[PDB]
């Protein structure tokens, strides 16, 4: 009665889009499903229809991630993953979820990231996001802080993007997490979606600029007006240099009529978190962001770059995909990461899971191993571990997808 | 008509801790000053006094703390830091802490630790606490989280102080942060006191064993029975330890399991709390992460030397201490996890930094290079920030110790 | 100055309908006054116009009810009754009450409802409703509780309006209360109106389907997205089945949908099989109010059209105060399987108001308690107890769809 | 290690009482374990005992209950059934429900009863809920009566407990033949309902008592109640009961009418509470239904022929005892208005049910037909179902009695 | 870089609107924007363009306002101030006060008026807080009058917009000489103040308008009002403004309002801080009055002022005035002035009251006590006995009120 397929046609592709919002109990958002299309692949989006209607949906973009080190590999930002209330309990999301993730291994993707809303398929946790809110007249900061000599204005979406993209191309490379963006995905980032326009405002963008004109740092943000207590809710702030950084944040947070700030899907080591000289001003609620699923575990230990020196041989076992299982050598440090089997004996035993949770130095693997949920089968090896697996960086979340 | 003297007597005691509760805008908990008085010091407790009247105060008590490599060092634990509202911008705070400062110096202890309640004295915020906090019923753990064989039982505080104490001090050289607790610390850690009944219950006490009767975890927690509408019982816990990963787990899942329980929260958590990472659904765990402990380094080489580091690192500090100038110097770190020196040095200098911001990721709760990606820390040769980033780092979070 | 007249036309049918709405603080409804003219017939739609705008209006829709016993007769759907705020104390309410109980007589109908929102007239509730609400998550039903072999599908309003309607007729029979639903009705019924999507959202179909294949299970709700910690919500609007295996199933899909949170079930039964289902009792709420208020107006042919849950012979001395004619000792006998009631000179063994004899005349009311409370007044010893449970029903009654 | 025994003295008694209101989150309430003393029996207070604490309770009170048609039977009512946090999973509930059950069946009583509640036995053991109680509540100035509800003659006056303890019990005795499940009250049970508990002071105030007089003098009426100042002052009742309408009628207008009140609220009250049909505006007054009392049948033929029908049935019953295996069998009940008959009889059955859900009719609370169209009951002969459910029901609701 | 000029075309004032409504954080409100471009004059809108984008707005409208005694004096309705998040802090507020409290002197103004909303100016440049409004809101079954309330014999019919414009304005006519603060309204300013706006609705619904009638027929009283539905038993009443031309058309006016069916709770903003129906409810406690800040005044011609308004009763005054912005208005003015005279003019003669000239806009309307500020240390008395027969004589026995909205 199913057929598992791919979107043929923009016909196929709304309704496909139709069902995934319907499943998560929302109308289609008709906005956001134009914008998103100039970037889909429709042979990556798969699903299982019954001749009227798709009932289960699982898709995926071609995008590109930082590691931890710089290099900017491809991975699979899976989306749109749903299975109708009325089709639960028929192996339809194990079955997409085997196809998926052999699609994704064909296309050279050494793992796939997915935002979390599945642990039995092998993705873990491994970035977190702050959602960090307060009173705007409560976060001044350290007086040391340097704003810098720089300006700012307010300019149309087709200014910003004309500036906005070379800075933060600029930026990520010391950002694991972050992914790059085509003017596409721009499109979709900066879109004035109904959806958040009801929550908040029309969307606003700012430019920083230096002394001597040049961009050096921007910022997104809807205003919520009264209505009772005016809101900020930022969606992105970034900057070249520290400067250009403070002073940017200072005109949000100096802004009259505004009382309240938010920005949701900030990083953990949100550098405005210690800009302020009241950190109990800033509240911070930490929660999951991306979950990563090792998919060729060699390649992935290798293109990472490590925070300390690192030989280690760790027992992976991967349930969901017993292919992968194995015992691997890790071989890594600042400058260079090698893995490849070894038959000498294991020092740790872990999952694929887990080792995908610490994968981007968001998640010690000490704390997994103190929890349980890891074993050390050699004394001081998972220490030394993960040191290296961390990153004086802290992962963060990418935009949406 | 101000003087600065340290406590003389009992009544004196008891003026200078009431007053301390006035400037909070609470009355004196007699209950708290009783027991904390076991193991007040009354000459490290300081004060002006107008003559009738405590105007301001500052104490410490001499403690103990864990340091990243598990290394136990003497640290001064600073409390009671008030100043009268009357009394403000006399310049009495700095005066308390000059004296206190020196005289922290002068009894050789390398730190001072602080509450988060100062940054222009060298204070710096080094270890974070999370409030964690959800519906039991959706605390359910991953499938391969192993429970163990063990068994609990409630017990009276006396019952829990013969066991608690060893299973307590077998676990701190893996947490850094934390602090030796003498018989007298464990009598105010586990006070039943009465402004916390009035927030949930009285405490209860918590003891797992071992199938060999091994007392291998304890907890302490307080009920707040449903006060609606609709049933909302609430459980405060304030402390959850265990000797392996099986009784940790397992006296977790006997809170979460428990009857009536329609919520609970645990205050002052670590921010890498394993029970975090236990939990099927993190989102159902809420995580709120605020400012712990301060710390104020006092005898920075010996400091930098006690602790132990995540990695090799060789580098060269050039630190400036406003407050302290006796402090300010240019000093080689070499450390490690099995080494680490810290002595002046005449090579070229790394890194700048102020003795607030080394403070701040003396514990390794706070990464060097947020700081200088921050613009509060400066790299003056390349790389050195990113390697000593790491090593300034432990695999293990610092975490909060009991309250004081 | 003032006319009391019927609707005219079609654009007197829309000022008609715009006043109703905004008596109650509401825009008007055009979505929901097109789809209810279908089944609207002019001449009961009265009220009073002042040469240019419409004061006061009261209408009527012609519906059929099903009795305890299963009989389907005849009744009354009263439906907006509204007094201008300018035009109040001036008794255009008892007028317009007085013209259309006089016009329901004449249409051999036997008694009027009239949905809660008037006990001088003769109106009095004789069923509840209930709110049904709770955290999905807490609402397990009890281990034995079969759950059947069928599926469900979520369809289009077509398709559902395909298999609805004769599950709703098979159903009916045994719940008293419950109106026969025409195509027009339908419509109605289950049009995605803009009223309830700001409440909520659009309204969803689903279809629950035996093995063979036969359609045996229904459900209406809307979703309400989280606007929050975690609130969505389902909101449902009726669930029916033709077996306790399509009923449960039917409740278990809505309950153990992902991402819902908390469900709600308004205007449903008192006795709804669901609050017996659940495991656990306190975690689905029940707040009990008042449903449908019923006005006897052919007394003796309403006692007669309705069975009974027992024998009964009693005479009734039944008081009239509103419509005087009606006053009269009526002796009714009863029961399963006959009912009848007539004038008699025997002695009375009750006295009662028309208002309280149709507030227990669907069996949702006891006549026992009206009695205990002195409102109703017993004549001879032992009379009441037996009236009481023979007035009764098994099932209680239960609201119809709105109108 | 654990032994099953009943309480053997009076610090017994305390420390078993401790244990149950710890496992509810509540610390002891003093005042109510002390007036309930005076009507509990030691050997009906079971439980389990580890040699240092009780780890799991049960007891039961002798007491009579009105059934529909006015008879007074023995009744056992169930009471602090507790099983520690600790303790749980090793069968000791089930262990106690065996022995309390046959202990109830050798004592002649026919059936228990037990307050549904946040109870560990909710729905367990045969236990069916088969009383409701209504919360009402309302903004008392919108809670006018119906115009022809007479309020009499009568007087009222606001009393102490013992003046009211003098004319409240014969009002009691008079009221309770007609209202299916109110119970016996002793002097030493009316100590205890009328107790200005500690617990019940923190939620509304003291509490006070109302006496109803008709013009001769006689009293016909009484209330009892707490206010509730402003922090939009309430007052919370606890019952109200007249000897005629318009002594009932009169009460609650006192009530409504008081100045000062903004709110009242009656938790417990009956669903066919008669207020709920004196008032005018009937949303007015929020109605709001939940389990009250559950039922166990122990004696399956002498409980059918101890209650009375509200009409005549003659029916096959096919009854499944699953804890009690002893009790399933088929028993044909013949009943009436004045007659009422059960015996194990192998004729063909007519309705096929479980203990539970006849327990959960036999007060005529719940419909037996809806529990048929609901799939829990099966009609094995066609028209069977009909007669027994009208048979089953009772003009008149049955009422949640005194707490306990 | 910036340039101060005036809005040229329908375009230019789309885009300088549009610029105001978004510093204060709003989208525009189209509709309220085309309605008051009906009474807007180009020239008096002022503003700072960059080239592309208006940076910073001033407007004021040609108004005229009643005076305590019943004179109607023209006004300048200051309006639209702002300026844009990324220009603060670079002088251009200043700019555009100054020049705009020149164009009013100009104009023959004496005055300028400005709500309290604008916080952009809020207490600066000379500008004092003269008039107050309360916020009276409470359940409509605890709001009984009391029982020697005359109600009349009269009727009331709910109209639309145009029938009510019909009799209105006649009646708002009527009512204002006794009624200081209050604005005249030509047709376009009806228009304005009676527009069913979007903004509005959303926030309770669709405009009502409500006509009282005499027994005869004539046209007595009005009431503006939303209905706001029972959402999630709590249906509100939002009242904009109720008057009557006589005690029994306002009380019969507010009691049709009060027992209106379904609804639960009423509230009305903007209403004076004396408004009748305060004194008319039998139980004040069940309306709840919260007071704040309504019209700022900036006097700009200080003697014209001084002597356009009556006062309450004899004053023979000499004023040292300070006006730290405008120092060419700074002087020592004796005021003689009562209820059927008024008087100002320089003098040498002794000083009595040291003042500035914010708190003179103040008491000018006669909301604010002048014994009050002296009391807190604002105001300075130089001869004894001057504050309390000034700050009598500056009172009136009728409060100012706010006008509509602007």
């Not at 499109?187 to 230096?210: C, I, M, N």
């Not at 998640?363 to 220490?383: D, K, P, Y």
Request: hydrophobic share 40%; aromatic share 8%; proline share 4%.
């Amino acid at each position: 009665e199913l057929t598992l397929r791919t979107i043929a046609d923009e016909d196929d592709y709304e309704s496909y889009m139709a069902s995934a919002y319907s499943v998560f109990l929302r109308d289609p958002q008709k906005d956001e499903i134009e914008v998103n299309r100039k970037f889909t692949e429709l042979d990556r989006m798969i699903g299982f229809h019954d001749g009227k209607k798709w009932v289960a949906t699982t898709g995926a973009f071609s995008r590109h991630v930082v590691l931890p080190g710089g290099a900017v590999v491809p991975v699979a930002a899976v989306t749109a993953v749903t299975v109708s209330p009325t089709h639960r309990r028929r192996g339809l999301l194990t079955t997409m979820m085997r196809h998926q993730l052999a699609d994704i291994r064909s296309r050279g993707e050494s793992l796939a990231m997915l935002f979390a809303s599945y642990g039995r398929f092998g993705y873990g946790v491994a970035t977190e996001s702050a959602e960090l809110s307060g009173q705007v007249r409560e976060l001044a900061f350290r007086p040391t802080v340097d704003l810098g000599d720089g300006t700012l204005e307010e300019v149309s979406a087709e200014t910003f993007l004309a500036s906005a993209p070379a800075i933060y191309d600029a930026v990520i490379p010391g950002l694991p997490g972050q992914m790059s963006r085509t003017p596409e995905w721009w499109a979709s980032w900066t879109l004035d979606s109904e959806e958040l326009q009801k929550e908040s405002g029309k969307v606003r963008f700012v430019l920083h600029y230096e002394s001597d004109g040049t961009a050096s740092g921007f910022a997104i943000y809807r205003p919520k007006p009264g209505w009772g207590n005016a809101e900020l809710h930022v969606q992105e702030v970034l900057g070249t240099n520290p400067r250009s950084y403070a002073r940017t944040w200072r005109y949000l947070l100096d802004m009259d009529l505004v009382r309240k700030i938010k920005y949701h899907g900030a990083s953990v080591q949100e550098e405005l978190r210690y800009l302020v000289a009241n950190h109990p001003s800033l509240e911070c609620v930490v929660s999951d962001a991306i979950q990563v699923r090792l998919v060729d575990i060699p390649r992935a230990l290798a293109q990472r770059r490590y925070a300390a020196d690192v030989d280690v041989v760790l027992e992976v076992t991967d349930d969901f995909l017993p292919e992968n299982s194995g015992r691997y050598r890790l071989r890594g440090g600042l400058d260079h990461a090698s893995c490849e089997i070894t038959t000498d004996d294991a020092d740790i035993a872990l999952t694929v899971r887990d080792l995908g949770s610490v994968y981007m130095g968001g998640v010690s693997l000490q704390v997994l191993a103190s929890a349980g949920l890891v074993t050390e089968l050699r004394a001081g090896a998972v220490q030394r571990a993960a040191t290296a697996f961390g990153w004086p960086v802290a992962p963060s979340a990418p935009d949406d997808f």
